Amino acid sequence: PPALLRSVLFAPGNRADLIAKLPRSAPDAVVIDLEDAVPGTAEAKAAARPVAHDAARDLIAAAPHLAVFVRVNALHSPYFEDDLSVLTPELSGVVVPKLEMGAEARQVAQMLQERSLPLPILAGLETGAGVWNAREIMEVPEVAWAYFGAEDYTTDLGGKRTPGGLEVLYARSQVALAARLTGVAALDIVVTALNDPETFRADAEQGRALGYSGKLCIHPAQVALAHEYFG
Amino acid sequence: PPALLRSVLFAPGNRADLIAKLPRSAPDAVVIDLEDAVPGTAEAKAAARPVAHDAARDLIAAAPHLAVFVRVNALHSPYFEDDLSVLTPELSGVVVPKLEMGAEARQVAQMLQERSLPLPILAGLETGAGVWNAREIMEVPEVAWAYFGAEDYTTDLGGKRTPGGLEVLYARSQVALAARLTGVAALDIVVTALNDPETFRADAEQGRALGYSGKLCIHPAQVALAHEYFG
Amino acid sequence: PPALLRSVLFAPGNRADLIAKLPRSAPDAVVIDLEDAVPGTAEAKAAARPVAHDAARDLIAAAPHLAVFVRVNALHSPYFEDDLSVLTPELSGVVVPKLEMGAEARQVAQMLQERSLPLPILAGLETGAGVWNAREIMEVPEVAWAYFGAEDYTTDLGGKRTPGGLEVLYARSQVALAARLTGVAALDIVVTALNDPETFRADAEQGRALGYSGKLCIHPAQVALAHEYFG
Ligand SMILES: O=C([O-])CC(=O)C(=O)O
Ligand SMILES: O=C([O-])CC(=O)C(=O)O
Ligand SMILES: O=C([O-])CC(=O)C(=O)O
Ligand SMILES: [Mg+2]
Ligand SMILES: [Mg+2]
Ligand SMILES: [Mg+2]
C-alpha cells in the first residue's frame, strides 16, 4: 500500500453488504473492523470472522487497487488470537487498536510472522499509554501508519469530547510529532457528526495543520471532504 | 478518603473561624492551608500552627466522613519541618505544594512515616519541574491525588494567565495524562474570579473534558458548580 | 550580551545596506543572517560571507553596546564550515538553526572552541527533533538562548500555519518549559504579517503568557511592539 493514505473508511466486519459497498466513494484505504464495530461476545466475534474473511477476499478481487485492511481486536483481548486466522497476505495491512508499548507492537509483529502473515501494522494510539509511548510504539519496524483515536483517548482519561478538541490537542500534537520522528504516516481523528460537512471541514483543517497526512472516515461522504485537505 | 474528590475547598490555616464554616457548602474535601493563605513571616507561620491544629482536630470530629486535609509549606521551605508537628493521624491526608521530583515525594513520605503520621499525599504540581516530572512524582506510592496549580506554574515560567488558559493547556493536559497512567486522582485549577459563575462553569467544563476528576475551590459557591461537572 | 533579549532583529547577510540600518530601532540584539535570508546556492552563500563579515565588524565599531550575532547555516548543511570564517571573537554570539540533538550543539561549541571563538550559542529549535529534544539541546552549557521557529517546525511536520497557532501550541509550550528548566532564555516565534501591529500584538501576548522572555523580529517596527510585552 502507499505510504500515504488520505482517507481510511471503516465498515463492520460482520456486514458483508457494507464491506462490498466500501469502494463506492473511492477511499485510499478501507478497514473491515472486527473490534468496535462488532459486539464484545465470544459468539459475535467468532461469527464475524468468516464473514469478514470472505468479504475481504471478494473486495480485493473486485477493487484490485484498493488498499484493504482488517482491524483485529486488541492484543490483550480474548479475541486477538482467533482474529489472526482472518488475515491473508493479500491485505495491505492489519490495524491493531489500543497499542500501548513498543513491546506490544513487537509481539504483534512476531505473532504475524509465525502465522506466516507478514502484514505492515497500522497502529492505534487511543489510550493514555498509547499517546505517552507514541514514539516507542511507532519506532517498531513493522509499524507503517498510526491513527490517534480521540474517542477512546478521552474515555480512557475520564474526559469528554468537544467540537474544538482542545481537550485532545496535546495528545493529537504529540502523536503527529512522534509520527514525523519515526517516519510513520499519521492518520487524524474520526468525526462523529455525520450531518454537517462544515464540522468535518473545520476538524480536517486542524488535523492537516498539525501534520497528519490522512484522516479516518466513518461515512462515505467524509472521503471527498478528507481529500480536500490531505494529499 | 475517597479515591475521587469532586471538590476541594480551601481555608486559611490561621483563621480558626473560617475553618469551622468549611462544612457548609458540603464539599468532598477541605484544605486547612498553612502555605499561601498565610503571610510569609517566620512568626506568622509558627503562630498559625496551633490554630490550624486545634481547628482541624475539632473539625474532623464535627464531620467524621468529610475528607480533611492540611496543606503544609513546600518541602524546601523553612517551615516544612515544624509544619509536620501540626499533623495528626485523623487527617485524611497532607497537601504538599510545589513538588518537583519523585525523590522529593519519597522524602516527604519517609519523613511522615518517621513522625508516625500515616498520611496519603495530595501533591501540588505547580512549577515547571513539577509538570515536567509529573509522572515520576505521581508514581510514588504515597501520592493519592494531585492538583495542577496554574497560578504558580505561570509565575514559575514567567508567563501570564488568561481566561482561555491556552498558556497552560500543555501543562494541564500533561498532568491529566500522567495522573491517569499512575492511578492518581487529578484535581483541576483554581478560578480566582469569585463574581461570575459562568467563568467557573466554562473553566470547570474544560477541566472535566481533559480528564480531571475534581477541582480546587476557593469559595463555597464554587463547590455546587464543581459538582455540576465532576462526579 | 545580556541573559535577557526582549527583541532580536534580523537582516539579510548579503545586504550591507540593510545590515547598517540594524541599530536604528535599538533592538536588544541583531542577527546578520547567512541562512534563510540568503538563497540556497554555493554562489549566493559565498558572495554573502564577506559582506556579513565586514558589515558585522562595521556595526560593532559603530554601536559598541549592541549585541551583534551572525546566524550560520544548519550544522549538517554544506555551508556550515565556511560560514564559521565569518565569525569573530567580537560577536556577542552565533545563531545555529535547526539544532536537533544535544550532541549537535556540543559539536558546534567544540568547533567554536578550536577556532578561538568564545561565542555562546543561540539555538534554533524549529523542527520535530529540535522540539522533541529541546531540553537536551538547551542543557548544553554553551547554549544561552533558544528560539522556537514555528515556520520550519510546521514545514518539517508537513503541517500548516494559522493565525491562532493552535497547530504549534504543543511545541511552543514545550520549548518554553524546557527553557525554564535549563536556565535558557526562550525567544518567541516570528510574525510574518507586517501590515498590522495588532496581529503582532496578539501574537506577542500569546508568547509572553507561555513564558517566553523575548521575540524574534523581522521588521524594525516590531521591536517597539515586542518591548511592550517582554522585559
Ligand atoms: O470504528 C470506527 O468507526 C472509528 C474508530 O474505530 C476509530 O476512529 O478509532
Ligand atoms: O490557595 C489558593 O487559594 C489556591 C491554591 O493554593 C492553588 O490554586 O493551588
Ligand atoms: O529569517 C527570518 O526572517 C526569521 C527566521 O529565520 C525565523 O524566525 O526563524
Ligand atoms: Mg478507534
Ligand atoms: Mg497553590
Ligand atoms: Mg528560523
What DSSP line would sit under C140-185, residue for residue?
STTEEEEEE-HHHHHHHHT----SS-GGGHHHHHHHHHHHHHHTPE
CA distance C6 to C16: 25
Alpha helices in chain B (DSSP H): 16-21, 42-46, 48-62, 80-84, 102-114, 128-132, 134-138, 150-157, 169-182, 197-210, 220-229
Strand partners, C30: C9, C68
Decide if A159 and B211 are in contact by the 8 Å CB cutoff: yes
Cell of B87: 499533623
Ligand 6 is an ion; residues with CB less than 5 A from it: C 149
Nearest to C30 by CA among C223, C200, C231: C223
> Is the distance from CB of B5 to CB of B144 less than 8 angstroms?
no
CA distance B99 to C181: 14
A131 interaction partners in chain B (CB closer than 8 Å): 177
Identify the three-state secondary structure at position C122: strand
B173 interaction partners in chain A (CB closer than 8 Å): 167, 169-171
Residue C59 CA to its chain's centroid (Å): 18
Angle of helix A169-182 relative to helix C150-157, nearest 10 degrees, comes to 70
What DSSP line would sit under A111-158, residue for residue?
HHHHTT----EEEEE-SHHHHHTHHHHHTSTTEEEEEE-HHHHHHHHT
From the CA of C190, how far away is ligand 3's center (Å)?
6
CA distance C169 to C167: 6
Determine whether the annotation assigns residue B167 to a binding site. no
Identity of the residue numbered C80 = F
With respect to CATH, is domain B1-231 assigned 3.20.20.60?
Answer: yes
From the CA of C226, how far away is ligand 6's center (Å)?
18
Q: What is the DSSP letter of C66?
A: S
CA distance A196 to C74: 46
Cα-trace Rg, chain A: 16
Determine whether the annotation assigns residue A152 to a binding site. yes
CA distances from C31 to A75, B40, C1, C13, C185 (A): 53, 44, 13, 9, 16
CA distance C126 to C121: 15
Alpha helices in A7-97 (DSSP H): 16-21, 42-62, 80-83
Cell of A27: 477511499
> Is the distance from CB of B96 to CB of B124 less than 8 angstroms?
yes
C177 interaction partners in chain B (CB closer than 8 Å): 128, 131-132, 157, 170-171
Identify the three-state secondary structure at position C83: helix
Nearest to B58 by CA among B27, B19, B85: B19
Strand partners, A147: A124, A187
Angle of helix A169-182 relative to helix B169-182, nearest 10 degrees, comes to 80
The set of chains that have 3 or more CB pairs under 8 A with C is: A, B
Q: Where are the domains of chain B?
A: 1-231
Identify the three-state secondary structure at position C221: helix
